[PDB]
Design an enzyme around this catalytic site. Structure first.
Site, PDB file in Angstrom:
ATOM      1  N   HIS B  60       0.861  -1.212   0.000  1.00 16.38           N
ATOM      2  CA  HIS B  60       0.000   0.000   0.000  1.00 16.38           C
ATOM      3  C   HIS B  60       0.889   1.251   0.000  1.00 16.38           C
ATOM      4  O   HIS B  60       0.395   2.330  -0.365  1.00 16.38           O
ATOM      5  CB  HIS B  60      -0.990  -0.050   1.176  1.00 16.38           C
ATOM      6  CG  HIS B  60      -1.731  -1.346   1.328  1.00 16.38           C
ATOM      7  ND1 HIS B  60      -1.592  -2.159   2.449  1.00 16.38           N
ATOM      8  CD2 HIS B  60      -2.638  -1.963   0.532  1.00 16.38           C
ATOM      9  CE1 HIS B  60      -2.373  -3.218   2.326  1.00 16.38           C
ATOM     10  NE2 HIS B  60      -3.028  -3.120   1.158  1.00 16.38           N
ATOM     11  N   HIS B  86       6.357   7.163   5.737  1.00 21.86           N
ATOM     12  CA  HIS B  86       5.920   6.498   4.486  1.00 21.86           C
ATOM     13  C   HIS B  86       5.447   7.592   3.528  1.00 21.86           C
ATOM     14  O   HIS B  86       5.392   8.790   3.914  1.00 21.86           O
ATOM     15  CB  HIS B  86       4.853   5.427   4.798  1.00 21.86           C
ATOM     16  CG  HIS B  86       3.606   6.029   5.348  1.00 21.86           C
ATOM     17  ND1 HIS B  86       3.375   6.128   6.708  1.00 21.86           N
ATOM     18  CD2 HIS B  86       2.582   6.664   4.746  1.00 21.86           C
ATOM     19  CE1 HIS B  86       2.241   6.765   6.909  1.00 21.86           C
ATOM     20  NE2 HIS B  86       1.750   7.132   5.724  1.00 21.86           N
ATOM     21  N   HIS B 111       4.581  11.341   5.198  1.00 20.46           N
ATOM     22  CA  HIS B 111       4.012  11.251   6.557  1.00 20.46           C
ATOM     23  C   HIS B 111       5.033  10.667   7.501  1.00 20.46           C
ATOM     24  O   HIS B 111       5.459   9.517   7.254  1.00 20.46           O
ATOM     25  CB  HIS B 111       2.737  10.413   6.552  1.00 20.46           C
ATOM     26  CG  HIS B 111       1.633  11.066   5.789  1.00 20.46           C
ATOM     27  ND1 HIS B 111       0.509  10.386   5.416  1.00 20.46           N
ATOM     28  CD2 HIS B 111       1.507  12.312   5.289  1.00 20.46           C
ATOM     29  CE1 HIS B 111      -0.290  11.198   4.748  1.00 20.46           C
ATOM     30  NE2 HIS B 111       0.288  12.374   4.666  1.00 20.46           N
ATOM     31  N   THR B 192      -5.449   7.725   7.464  1.00 20.02           N
ATOM     32  CA  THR B 192      -6.018   7.739   6.091  1.00 20.02           C
ATOM     33  C   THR B 192      -6.113   6.321   5.514  1.00 20.02           C
ATOM     34  O   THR B 192      -6.529   6.187   4.322  1.00 20.02           O
ATOM     35  CB  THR B 192      -5.223   8.643   5.151  1.00 20.02           C
ATOM     36  OG1 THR B 192      -3.955   8.019   4.918  1.00 20.02           O
ATOM     37  CG2 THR B 192      -5.113  10.036   5.738  1.00 20.02           C
ATOM     38  N   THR B 193      -5.772   5.310   6.310  1.00 17.67           N
ATOM     39  CA  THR B 193      -6.045   3.888   5.984  1.00 17.67           C
ATOM     40  C   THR B 193      -6.811   3.262   7.129  1.00 17.67           C
ATOM     41  O   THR B 193      -6.756   3.751   8.250  1.00 17.67           O
ATOM     42  CB  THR B 193      -4.751   3.129   5.695  1.00 17.67           C
ATOM     43  OG1 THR B 193      -3.963   3.142   6.884  1.00 17.67           O
ATOM     44  CG2 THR B 193      -3.969   3.754   4.564  1.00 17.67           C
TER      45      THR B 193
HETATM   46  N1  LIG Z   1      -1.711   7.818   6.279  1.00 14.65           N
HETATM   47  S1  LIG Z   1      -1.451   7.608   7.868  1.00 14.65           S
HETATM   48  O1  LIG Z   1      -0.429   8.486   8.384  1.00 14.65           O
HETATM   49  O2  LIG Z   1      -2.727   7.827   8.466  1.00 14.65           O
HETATM   50  C1  LIG Z   1      -0.852   6.105   8.224  1.00 14.65           C
HETATM   51  C2  LIG Z   1      -0.406   5.786   9.535  1.00 14.65           C
HETATM   52  C3  LIG Z   1       0.123   4.520   9.866  1.00 14.65           C
HETATM   53  C4  LIG Z   1       0.618   4.129  11.248  1.00 14.65           C
HETATM   54  C5  LIG Z   1       1.944   3.678  11.399  1.00 14.65           C
HETATM   55  C6  LIG Z   1       2.488   3.322  12.636  1.00 14.65           C
HETATM   56  C7  LIG Z   1       1.693   3.394  13.749  1.00 14.65           C
HETATM   57  C8  LIG Z   1       0.371   3.813  13.622  1.00 14.65           C
HETATM   58  C9  LIG Z   1      -0.167   4.197  12.390  1.00 14.65           C
HETATM   59  C10 LIG Z   1       0.238   3.565   8.853  1.00 14.65           C
HETATM   60  C11 LIG Z   1      -0.167   3.840   7.543  1.00 14.65           C
HETATM   61  C12 LIG Z   1      -0.054   2.749   6.515  1.00 14.65           C
HETATM   62  C13 LIG Z   1       0.399   3.001   5.212  1.00 14.65           C
HETATM   63  C14 LIG Z   1       0.466   1.949   4.295  1.00 14.65           C
HETATM   64  C15 LIG Z   1       0.083   0.655   4.666  1.00 14.65           C
HETATM   65  C16 LIG Z   1      -0.372   0.392   5.959  1.00 14.65           C
HETATM   66  C17 LIG Z   1      -0.444   1.440   6.877  1.00 14.65           C
HETATM   67  C18 LIG Z   1      -0.712   5.105   7.232  1.00 14.65           C
HETATM   68 ZN   LIG Z   2       0.152   8.301   5.319  1.00 13.39          ZN
END
Ligand SMILES: NS(=O)(=O)c1cc(-c2ccccc2)cc(-c2ccccc2)c1
Ligand SMILES: [Zn+2]
Ligand SMILES: NS(=O)(=O)c1cc(-c2ccccc2)cc(-c2ccccc2)c1
Ligand SMILES: [Zn+2]
Lengths: 251, 251
Positions: B60, B86, B111, B192-193
């Site tokens: 993703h 990411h 982010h 946002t996921t």
């Molecule tokens: N877009 S986001 O910022 O809201 C976001 C936060 C976190 C997140 C990460 C660590 C702890 C807690 C939350 C993970 C992702 C994510 C992106 C791709 C695939 C799976 C998850 C995305």
């Molecule tokens: Zn993100």
């Protein structure tokens, strides 16, 4: 712990030595206008007379335990549940509000303590940012008997003794607060008694509520605390902002 | 889940249908200026080349795991620890930022996800106000090759496969972020996921970072996701504010 004397507040709880404590001296000229601060919204504060509420002399204050269903919002998505309210007061010709404005201490202060909806219990909220929210209003002398306050103050005689409590009918809890929910100061701080946990959102109303001289005398003159001492001057000393910026809902 | 497939987003987690989600369209003219929003403080971000860091294609997005010691403050006593960063990106000349500015979508967005110091675990922070904070910046096309970003884009070939990961040398994470830490937008929203948990403090830098056209092509065109699908357009649609006011750190 007991105001004026000792036990040493840090020796009780290390959080009472934090950098970001309450109460504080509000200097409106140093406050930051934030037009994001909308009017407070209260829901369910107009109680039926039954069930009754418990009013308690805990020897540090008088507190009213609030029932479930009192919802307060600081803004959209900032939702809280009211737990209880209590008072701070001084003595015969001595003010006892916790907060000050430009060094002015007001006769008395009401605190209505709330729990973020994200938390089921106070102990999960303590020290967490925004976990607890307190609404603070100053009490000043006006000409009329305040009828909402009269429902509590007419019962202080029943709870003169430290650790005493009594049942009181449900009332309009919103009627112990100012009518203006638009104009307020907001800062982050602590509980003002042990354990003085930080992360507390304080909202201090600009508008004050009016009690009669007799009402103010009843509050300061009726209750006893630890030992044979009158329950009086039950306020914590003002704490430095230490670089925090108080916000205001108005320029 | 996938990026708007089947997968039903309210069906995977109904939190995706909450009132206070991310991302949002930023309208600077409608932002509330609060002089209380101080410059962001980021300490410990200048990492040494060793130990090396996990860079992973989770299908993703591409994520970099960050070690302990990256300290971040949104204010006084509002402290955070970086967990990971990411990116979100578009396709062949199609912008893939999550946030928009007055309807403008930028080529890509970074982010940096942080955990409040008041929470030991991410899972205690999920759904709690301020438990997580994200620093967001827009990646735009500029004439020069970006040195900080090259350290990551050069290593993408090695992780084109879904689930693939490599180790990469420590780098200055703060070098991936814009010039002025005093100029940002700030609001409360969601992941946002899935699981789309609310209580996330989003801080979106006003100014952008520039990558070369090649670099932004490297980013969009190198990775594969679920099936024989290119990992691209990995951004959620814009969500309504529902009464939330975006704040700004500058007049
Ligand atoms: N877009 S986001 O910022 O809201 C976001 C936060 C976190 C997140 C990460 C660590 C702890 C807690 C939350 C993970 C992702 C994510 C992106 C791709 C695939 C799976 C998850 C995305
Ligand atoms: Zn993100
Ligand atoms: N002054 S205060 O707002 O910070 C505060 C005072 C008192 C207090 C009450 C009576 C006598 C003595 C002190 C109790 C709390 C409290 C904190 C969490 C949950 C419930 C109540 C909060
Ligand atoms: Zn109090």
């Amino acid at each position: 712990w007991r105001y004026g004397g000792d036990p040493p507040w840090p020796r009780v709880s290390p959080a009472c030595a934090g950098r970001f404590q309450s109460p504080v001296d509000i200097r409106p000229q140093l406050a930051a206008f934030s037009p994001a601060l909308r009017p407070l919204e209260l829901l369910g504060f107009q109680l039926p007379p039954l069930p009754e509420l418990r009013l308690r002399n805990n020897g540090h204050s008088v507190q009213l335990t609030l029932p479930p269903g009192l919802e307060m919002a600081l803004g959209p998505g900032r939702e809280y549940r009211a737990l209880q309210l209590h008072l701070h007061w001084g003595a015969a010709g001595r003010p006892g509000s916790e907060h000050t404005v430009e060094g002015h201490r007001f006769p008395a202060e009401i605190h209505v303590v709330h729990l973020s909806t994200a938390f089921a219990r106070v102990d999960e909220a303590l020290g967490r940012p925004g976990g607890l929210a307190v609404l603070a209003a100053f009490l000043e002398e006006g000409p009329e008997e305040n009828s909402a306050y009269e429902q509590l103050l007419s019962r202080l005689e029943e709870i003169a003794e430290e650790g005493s409590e009594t049942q009181v009918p449900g009332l309009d809890i919103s009627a112990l607060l100012p009518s203006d929910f638009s104009r307020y100061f907001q800062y982050e701080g602590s509980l003002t008694t042990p354990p003085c946990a930080q992360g507390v959102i304080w909202t201090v109303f600009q508008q004050t509520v009016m009690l009669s001289a007799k009402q103010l005398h009843t509050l300061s003159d009726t209750l006893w605390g630890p030992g044979d001492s009158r329950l009086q001057l039950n306020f914590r000393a003002t704490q430095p902002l230490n670089g925090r910026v108080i916000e205001a809902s108005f320029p």
